[PDB]
Amino acid sequence: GDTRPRFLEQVKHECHFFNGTERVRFLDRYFYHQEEYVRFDSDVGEYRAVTELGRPDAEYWNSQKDLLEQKRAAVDTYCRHNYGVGESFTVQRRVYPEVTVYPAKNLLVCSVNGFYPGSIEVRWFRNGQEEKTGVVSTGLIQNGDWTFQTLVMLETVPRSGEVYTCQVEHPSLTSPLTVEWRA
Amino acid sequence: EEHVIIQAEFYLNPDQSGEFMFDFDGDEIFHVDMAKKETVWRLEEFGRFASFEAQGALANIAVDKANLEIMTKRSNYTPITNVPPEVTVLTNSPVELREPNVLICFIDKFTPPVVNVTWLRNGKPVTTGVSETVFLPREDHLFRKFHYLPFLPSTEDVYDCRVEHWGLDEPLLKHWEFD
């Protein structure tokens, strides 16, 4: 459509948590288009110019004491505070997946659907034994609705009287999910 | 298991439009509606367990504009290089006839965060039953967006997700049908 130049300013305040809140890290990042020009890292304590465009802001911001204090407290006042408020339904959110096995579209496909979080382990079994052979997976698709999806198929020429299994481990389940489909 | 919460925002000139949103591990917790000054939760239930002073976000956007001014001048008006989107359309689950599903249009890896998206069923529009997400940030600082269309599969119908972006030199139609 247009061609009239666009100017984009991006800002990102990141809270990285490790083992719950045992190790919080705050990043205050500013970008010009896709370019990060300056950033504050909690494990560093001050502003660092990421590119020469940020040199001016870093030298000035880092001289303000009230502002620095505030960014330094952020891991507590901001990161930890917010974690405790949303953990109730973000970190602890769990939706079991719906597993489906169908011949294919000879590929025996295994479709694990509508689950959350991301942690997932899907294995295929040839008559009881695992198959790390010819297993193409479509990574881990994100649906944009706090739901994930992934397809993992088995490349094979099925014989008669042979059980094929798809095991699915997932935080939302106590026992592993299993879908057996022989032939 | 590392977890990450990010407060993402942006301001775009000359469109004079911005965004303010919270992200948890790549998903949107909510974003702020600048005009109504209300906080729009990605999921209805989220508002039951939390809240956010929606208006404070304007202060951030106001400064992000201020800085774009400064920043756009220190670089001597170097505009942004467009990056057309990679569009995909897959079903929300395995497809079965006469069995209700949801078509999704994954628009991803692109900038600026401006785009026109239209769903077409049998070559014509569908302005009802559709929803959409705002621009979600990417690890590389580009964006992704989701558009959705609830539908009843049938050989009888064919669909197109039409997308217009400035990086493209012509609208894009990613097809989806039942073979």
Partner: peptide, 5 residues
């Protein structure tokens, strides 16, 4: 939620 430019 508390907000942190």
């Amino acid at each position: 939620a508390r907000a942190x430019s």
